[model samples]
Target: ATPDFPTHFPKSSIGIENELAGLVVAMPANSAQKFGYVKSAQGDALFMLTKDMNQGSYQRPPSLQDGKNYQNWQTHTVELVSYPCEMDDKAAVETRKQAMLWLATHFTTHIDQSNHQPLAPIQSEDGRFVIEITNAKHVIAAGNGISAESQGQTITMTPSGQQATVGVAAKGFGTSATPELRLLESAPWYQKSLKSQFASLTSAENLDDKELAANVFAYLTSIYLKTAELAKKFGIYINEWDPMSEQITPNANGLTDPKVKNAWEILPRTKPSKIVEILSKSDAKAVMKHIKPQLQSRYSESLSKNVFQYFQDGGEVAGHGINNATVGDKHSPELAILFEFRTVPNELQSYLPKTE
Candidate 1:
């Protein structure tokens, strides 16, 4: 049975009456906001609440009668870019992926004080999103760098933000819709983002409070396993997805549910795209067959067991010290694409480190 997935086809909010823009929470000029979106009707959406300057109207800012850029923005037209995801909608995986690609390539850039601080989506009291972008600076874009590598049949982003190839092994193995390969290529972006956010943790000064470090590692793994929400959206089951909850539900067999802070974390990763293959084979399983091992190959068994243990006891026991090497000597590009990170403070840094 195909798993349940939601649909989020992107569209501009501009209208004669700015009708789509009206749905979004009001925002000040030069600001960006986000809300959780699962189809406009399924529930509240995670929208980047800002203006599309192209749509000039009195409702938005910076009028012909006004001064500098976007100063009187609300007087102008509104461009509400929303992700509409429904609880049980079905779409061709490619169709959904294309929508994501459009987001990566088209959304205007907004910076909060030059620091592109990614605001992970959080739920408001009513179950809608409350994104914090108090001082965000808008930079409407020609396009974002995330879309740079869409041509790759399979993609793994590089350290310098270049996309390395994926799916070569299974290129000749899968069908035109290489669903397995499609999702695999995209996980790293989220993985890489979290890696960067916590990358400094691996080299912390603290080395005693092992529990602190282990939980963080475990947390990261859960996210890693469940990083690709597209898997769920595509109706392919991979892990029990838990969105942004630190709480763990215990099971005797040992379990760690997949989790993530922001559904939009995907924005920073690879551009969504279809599979590219070189082999003459057109069978889906041929390529799908190899993906499981490929994922496992990335982590040693010892690492996997130690990590999964977090699921069993609700992380009551600290996970083993993580030293899985997805790293090159020190740091640089290999196959996994790495994005640069600016260090921030974390309590885990005081306990121990998780080496790459």
Candidate 2:
């Protein structure tokens, strides 16, 4: 899960509060290339060493510190490198591929054999895999060296040599969730519009700690609360939501949007632009009113407790920097904060931004 993270100041950074010498990190770059495979696809990738916008501080290397390459940034103003919604591009793809390729071949001669001699790219056979990595020493010894290539269904100097083609399980069974739910899950297709929307919402950057925390509060409130409300009302019970399926005329998967043309039908934007607006102008007390409709078997107070804990938690990797704080992360898992006002008895509302 962790990448190179070279002690060389971690070329980039993770979340908002994670600033190192005016540099910051936020995870989430777009690349289709997975960790060990240079294999490519035109899709969103995770753990991309994203350095745009949130690249934190700019460090000048000693050699270039006073060179023309440094430019006239002494001109007293700053310029932005890239915007958030720009995502990854061709250059990003190539960089990731080169790095992954290097990792694929970083070791050779099987570190165990007492033979440090570099190995050649083992040729591939039909229906067989080749890891074929070169020893790093060879690359260091030669200013320029032979190229490395990984092939077959499996890749990596992962030491399963001496011939054997491992089996790959079917893709459909990767998750325990239903096929239809998978259709709605994270991917560029489903999330593209949302990214644009969210980026626009958070167009301003470089907020202080409390401001940033408040932003996360509004974000969590709008996203989760609205998601819960909508899905509770509109999800399932029919095949209408699955876009990959078809409804008529020799259909692909027998799915259709039950578009209601009659005078009576319930349809919401589902992505929650309006949902965000409601929280943007809301205080804790007003938020309680909004949650009234969604109320049921007492999840809000506990929900409030959880929301309060969110801030209490963002304390390891969240803030602390040289200090500590940490959270619930994704893995079919998962924030909100003033949200406690929705349940005053919970007392989390006390933590809300107090005002006259």
Candidate 3:
């Protein structure tokens, strides 16, 4: 069972509001490397950090300010720094081997406990050259630094990273139900849909705080509601059931089954041009109406009980930051609610413009 939050903390700090100016995955310069890790014929990585895209004005703590300067961002020239011993490039491989041989003959040294100094490479009984990295104080002091002989050139590790911080603000006191919901709404993925939906809800006109909040809540949770409705339509069920259970229970884990997984996987596989053609034709109002009650139930279950209070009301969502969480401080595990909304246009489609 989850524990309650401390009484002294401010209420308004419980949820998220407004802009995001922290780190996000920046697309690689070339399609060859989309995210950080490379791919093979088998498949690409499931998740990766591409680069950071810092924007907006979010004040960060001193501990989280390192590597925040955009000026430090620069492109690196791609080249084959080195090749393994099995390289087939005879000339290139011979050059590197010659360098290694020269270094072994000149730099290799015999160990002497009496002298005590140990800043030299040691030649093993097998004639393989090895350096005692533990005695390299200079390299040790330069944390996260390691070098290698690539081809005949020396290659040192790059020193670059990013960090981001967040703040929370809300109305009145006590439970910050709306603000917590607003934080989830503030995610980059949902912002476009909320903005578009808000424009439609108000006919692009101005709205008071109450009217605006209601609409935001409606649109913010729309994807989840819409997804549940669609899942039901496809004979997929959503319930909190123990997957390990054997007997046919009243509320079983239908979503954990492959049928539900296979159903949801279709969205990404669909061609970009057909996305709107397929979903936009559906009755938007009908989708929302069907899931209204379920949405309310989700709200009551999540918000009324202060489920997200562990995230520390205005602080950046834990684990999503460019840097690690505050030292020694344990935060509530992030509770993510994800579902597909095919009706919403893909944000990347504009870049492709013409291709899938």
Candidate 4:
């Protein structure tokens, strides 16, 4: 939770509508970082930070009339900043090692605090156990001052006989419900392909907001719906669960069971290219229709309401040429926005809102 906001602007300031400014304030250039400690695979203490997309606006006097020269003109622009701490990468590696150790302590139907750090990496000690991470490390442009590294050896050993040889993967556990269900139950009634794709697209610690993820899921749903709408355009007829029938929704824990093959199968003669093309289109409504009932039940009206509230709740320390709107990425638990004031040139006065 954060502090209350001021409804009125300062008398010397110009007012700005929030909707227009929040977009620019939450851009890549405005990112901020946060960090913390965690346990490592080797049981070493690891550290990490929460990053946020913070946004806000500023206001000022517009002119030389106040002894403000071209440089002294009051100007305000929405700003964005990363909220993750400087040490996240180093800490994630260590915490991942710790997660492995924690897992070694539990064999079957066991849960522990070892994997509970917001800044810690979720990994297992032994390679026999599958450590699947979805779309965590995203592509960063070469000059972003960040470096990428692979976990040198894919195999790991632990004191406990529980070896994590294979890995499990998916997205939105930290941000959405279906992923949360997958995390605990390992499957959901539908969206298995979306789950697989998310796991395939992301790796550990690469975070995404609801809006971005919603876009991706929307596209995927559209692909399935389009196939259903136009069977000829698909490689094989996409046989969705008979939502109207008394079908046994597969349990997440054992979804991959061979028994499911009995339910339906994609015909060999179907065209794969057609299926791909229909999915390539971006349409949220169509996607929602395909997955709405499940999603509504899982998260009530949506799987990403958590993300919507995150931005809604983060309103304090929002301005000072800083962002007033912010979403808690991994950065919420740590650092955040601050306010500041300074003089500017008069020629640039018009850039500032009119405050006469």
Name the top TM-score candidate: 2
Candidate 3: 10-residue stretch with minimal lDDT: 14-23
lDDT by residue (tens digit), candidate 4, 1-356: 11122222211111111111111111122222322222333533322212222222211113212342223111122111111212124443333444433332331112112111111234544532232212222111111111122222112231221111101112222234532223322222134456444444444423334333443453334323332322221222112323223233323222122222212121011111212222224432233333444333433222123222221233111111222322234343211112111221232122222212
Local error of candidate 4 at residue 139 (angstroms) = 45
For candidate 2, give the lDDT of residue 132: 30
Model 1 error, position 307 (Å): 48
Cα deviation at 20, candidate 2, in Å, is 29
Per-model TM values vs. the true structure: 0.20, 0.24, 0.21, 0.18
Residue-level lDDT of model 2, residues 213-268, one tens digit each, is: 33323333433343333222333112123222222122221112222101011111
Which of 2 and 4 is the better model by lDDT?
Answer: 4
Off by over 4 Å in 2: 1-86, 110-219, 222-300, 308-356
lDDT of 1 at 207: 33
For candidate 4, give the lDDT.
0.25
lDDT of candidate 3 over 1-356, digit per residue (tens): 11111212222111100111111111113323222221112331111112223322222224433554423222222111111111123443343333333332232221111111213434334443332222121111011111111122222211121111121221111122554344334433332344344445544333344333434344324435433433334433233322223222323234334344334331211111111111223333332333345455644343212212221132111112222111111353211122221222232121111100
Q: How far does residue 12 in candidate 3 sit from its true spot (Å)?
A: 25
Which consecutive 10 residues in model 1 have the weakest lDDT in total? Answer: 11-20
Ranking by TM-score: 2, 3, 1, 4
Model 2 vs truth, CA RMSD:
24.0
User: Model 4 — which ten-residue stretch has the worst lDDT?
Assistant: 17-26
